């Protein structure tokens, strides 16, 4: 088990400086390099630097940010990234290399997220149609999870029952407060005939809303 | 920098069809050795990358023989000469001769299926949300392939991109479409000042944008 276990998900402050870990285990740990990567969300990897003991390297993109320091004695290398913006939202990966090998190990990555955001429980509104969708085979209804943070919600409907014709979309940062929206769509047989319920769970506020779709 | 130029950004697949995807370096990725240190990593939704092909060629070891790598210089070529349901995930080309070292933006390996239009759905805010001072505009567009869709707003006639947020899922499991949602956010004191609210969607599969309406002062 050559592994390499990085820290855990960091929320920090803008303007805060956090330092991720990369400890290496079950190789030599002086017979590689570390590598450090970010991902940005939807985006590539972006190379970081190196840090290896008497030979760091960083991408020039991130000499005023990073800082990699690397403890041989535990076997542990840090990436300490400061003045932090949202910006810098990303998933960091730490990676081996050594001469004549490439990335062959790498760690699981730790997402980073930027924000000034206290937790706050979403407002959950029911989208129901306008009313001119009420002929169709098929009706879609949706909820709005607006104004939440951090991550996750989880989006049920009819509290799991309605698997199908389920679209949750990704949530979006509005106003430093997240927003998701979830659609489904039912038979016009189904609706309003039968209760439709979206079901809103924020763990981090401990909160779950279960709103009624009721026609407008 | 040498920038690593992957095409295409996205490649619709049949399962058991070949893929090939291209990278070509803004330099050549010949190291003074005389090596080309050219390497594929498939990364999946929520993992590390995972490395595929080293020096142009070769594959990682478990790296199954369905993968090559060939070329020469700044233009190389992944090809998956099966593609399994595994395989799907972005495959990132990465050159290791030159510092900084870099990455291409990364193909996916979208799974291809018949076009399909999106249905579209308008929902004006709903009471509740007007009572808390906002009004949220949301437009669905489900359910629609190719992924390439454009969503524009119209107020009252006039397009409005100020206040929107567009989201999008990922290729669905089941049924290998996508889907988005458009969202409008005023205030309600805007909402209130304008009376047609159009979500129109312009897809590959019509001509025309795809447009649902509704009418503030209708129900």
């Known amino acids: 088990e050559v592994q390499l276990e990085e820290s855990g998900p960091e929320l920090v402050k803008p303007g805060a400086s956090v330092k991720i870990s990369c400890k290496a285990s079950?190789?030599?740990?002086?017979?590689?390099?570390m590598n450090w990567l970010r991902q940005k969300p939807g985006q590539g990897l972006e190379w970081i630097g190196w840090?290896?003991?008497?030979?760091?390297k960083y991408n020039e993109k991130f000499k005023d940010k990073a800082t990699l320091t690397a403890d041989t004695s535990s076997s542990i290398v840090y990436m300490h990234l400061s003045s932090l913006t949202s910006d810098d939202n990303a998933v960091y990966f730490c990676?081996?290399?050594?001469?004549?090998?490439?990335?062959?190990?790498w760690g699981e990555g730790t997402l980073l997220t930027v924000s000034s955001a206290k937790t706050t429980p979403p407002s959950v509104y029911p989208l129901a149609p306008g009313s001119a969708a009420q002929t169709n085979s098929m009706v879609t209804l949706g909820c709005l999870v607006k104004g939440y943070f951090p991550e996750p919600v989880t989006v049920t409907w009819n509290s799991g029952s309605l698997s199908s014709g389920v679209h949750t979309f990704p949530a979006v940062l509005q106003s430093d407060l997240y927003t998701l929206s979830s659609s489904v769509t039912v038979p016009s047989s189904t609706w309003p005939s039968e209760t439709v319920t979206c079901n809103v769970a924020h763990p981090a506020s401990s909160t779950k809303v279960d709103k009624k779709i009721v026609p407008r | 920098d040498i920038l690593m130029t992957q095409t295409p950004l996205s490649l619709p697949v049949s399962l058991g069809d070949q893929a090939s995807i291209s990278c070509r370096s803004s330099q050549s990725i010949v190291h003074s050795n005389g090596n080309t240190y050219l390497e594929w990593y498939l990364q999946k939704p929520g993992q590390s990358p995972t490395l595929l092909i080293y020096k142009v060629s070769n594959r990682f070891s478990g790296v199954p023989d369905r993968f090559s790598g060939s070329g020469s210089g700044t233009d190389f070529t992944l090809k998956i000469s099966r593609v399994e349901a595994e395989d799907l995930g972005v495959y990132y080309c990465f050159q290791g001769s030159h510092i900084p070292l870099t990455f291409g933006a990364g193909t996916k390996l979208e799974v291809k299926r018949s076009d399909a239009a999106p249905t579209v759905s308008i929902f004006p805010p709903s009471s509740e949300q007007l009572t808390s001072g906002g009004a949220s505009v949301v437009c669905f567009l489900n359910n629609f392939y190719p992924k390439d869709i454009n969503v524009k707003w119209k107020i009252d006639g006039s397009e409005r991109q100020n206040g929107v947020l567009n989201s999008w899922t990922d290729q669905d499991s089941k049924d290998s479409t996508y889907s988005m949602s458009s969202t409008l956010t005023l205030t309600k004191d805007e909402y209130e000042r304008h009376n047609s609210y159009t979500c129109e969607a312009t897809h590959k599969t019509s001509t025309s944008p795809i447009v649902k309406s509704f009418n503030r002062n209708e129900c």
């Open positions: 990676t081996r290399w050594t001469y004549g090998s490439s990335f062959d190990y």
């Open positions: 840090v290896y003991p008497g030979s760091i």
């Open positions: 079950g190789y030599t740990f002086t017979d590689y390099y």
